[PDB]
């Protein structure tokens, strides 16, 4: 594997107005209770493609992706985490509201997917970021899992890689769990305005990318471990996740 640039391994957590990281254990409880409405998601584009799949299995699978952080969950039938679909068609596949009261909401726009999900299908094909093998059907599932996993990151108190020091409704982004010494995949919390996760992931893997490849990076997981215990954003135990390695120098 190639060497992921530090900027793509940087993980930013949500701190309040006094530099203290939100505690997602305190916010959600020891177990994250969440609701997911019954429908299978009905996305399809014209180039015409066709696809439907259960929202519940993807929230299921995505959550398990983040399980190495030590978080534990439980789907609860309709202050609770809310998943849903929307139809704004507004140039934004997914969106999450982080709520310190516990009622964090994640929405997956269906209209935006139908419009812009394949806008990068063959600039990804030809650069070899995705296998020429894959169908329009599974490039849309790939994008959906990535989108959902990314939004889960937000549920769990993470922001985007480049939002350190930036102000948000409930505070400020502060870098957590820094580790530059250990090579790893790019964060799945890359700012989508500035990076294409698939392209960066492929760049790292030095080959086309499938769905067994995507997921939270090592630092993403350590970031959530920090968010699970909260505390000061200036604490060294919170700011660094492999500084012990410095002793080997």
């Amino acid at each position: 594997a190639e060497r992921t640039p530090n900027e793509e391994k940087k993980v930013i957590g949500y701190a309040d107005h006094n530099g203290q990281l939100y505690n997602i254990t305190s916010i959600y409880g020891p177990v994250i209770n969440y609701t997911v409405p019954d429908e299978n998601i009905t996305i399809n584009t014209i180039n015409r493609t066709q696809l439907t799949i259960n929202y519940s299995d993807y929230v299921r699978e995505a959550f398990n992706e983040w399980a190495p952080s030590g978080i534990r969950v439980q789907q609860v039938s309709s202050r609770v985490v809310s998943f849903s679909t929307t139809n704004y068609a507004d140039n934004s596949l997914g969106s999450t509201i982080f709520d310190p009261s516990g009622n964090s909401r994640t929405r997956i726009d269906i209209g935006s997917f139908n419009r812009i999900v394949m806008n990068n299908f063959e600039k990804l094909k030809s650069r070899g970021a995705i296998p020429a093998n894959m169908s329009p059907e599974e490039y849309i599932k790939l994008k959906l899992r990535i989108t959902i996993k990314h939004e889960i990151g937000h549920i769990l108190g993470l922001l985007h890689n480049n939002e350190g020091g930036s102000y948000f409704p409930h505070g400020v982004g502060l870098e957590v769990a820094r580790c530059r010494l250990l090579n790893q995949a790019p964060s799945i919390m890359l700012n989508g305005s500035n990076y294409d996760y698939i392209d960066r992931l492929s760049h790292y893997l030095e080959r086309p990318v499938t769905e067994t490849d995507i997921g939270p990076s090592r630092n993403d997981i350590e970031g959530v471990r920090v968010m699970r215990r909260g505390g000061s954003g200036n604490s060294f135990t919170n700011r660094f996740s492999c500084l012990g390695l410095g002793l080997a120098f």
């Binding site: 604490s235 060294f236 135990t237 660094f240 500084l243 012990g244 410095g246 002793l247």
Partner: protein, 103 residues
């Protein structure tokens, strides 16, 4: 031969064991002439030094003095908890003889 910091500390007069389980709150380092030393303090105000090297030190202690200063700096940077310090109490600040780090 001692097996632990308490056994070691009991071999010396004018020493005491401090049980801390706390991270270092402040790290101070000086290269100033005749004050070439390190001072650490904890959140409860407890303060310790690694002494300026002098005639109270054997030649065999010169590198260990430097190693201890390295260890304390690393402990400060990483924010790890210090389990115990053994210190000479007839110095002000109390002077570190040994350190224990524990999981």
């Amino acid at each position: 031969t001692p097996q632990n910091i308490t056994d070691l500390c009991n071999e010396y007069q004018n020493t005491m064991i401090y049980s801390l389980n706390k991270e270092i709150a402040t790290y101070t380092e000086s290269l100033a002439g005749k004050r070439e030393m390190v001072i650490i303090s904890f959140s409860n105000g407890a303060t310790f030094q690694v002494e300026v090297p002098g005639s109270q030190h054997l030649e065999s202690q010169k590198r260990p003095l430097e190693r201890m200063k390295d260890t304390l700096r690393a402990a400060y940077f990483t924010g790890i908890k210090i389990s115990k310090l053994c210190a000479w109490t007839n110095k002000s600040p109390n002077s570190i003889a040994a350190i224990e780090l524990s999981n």
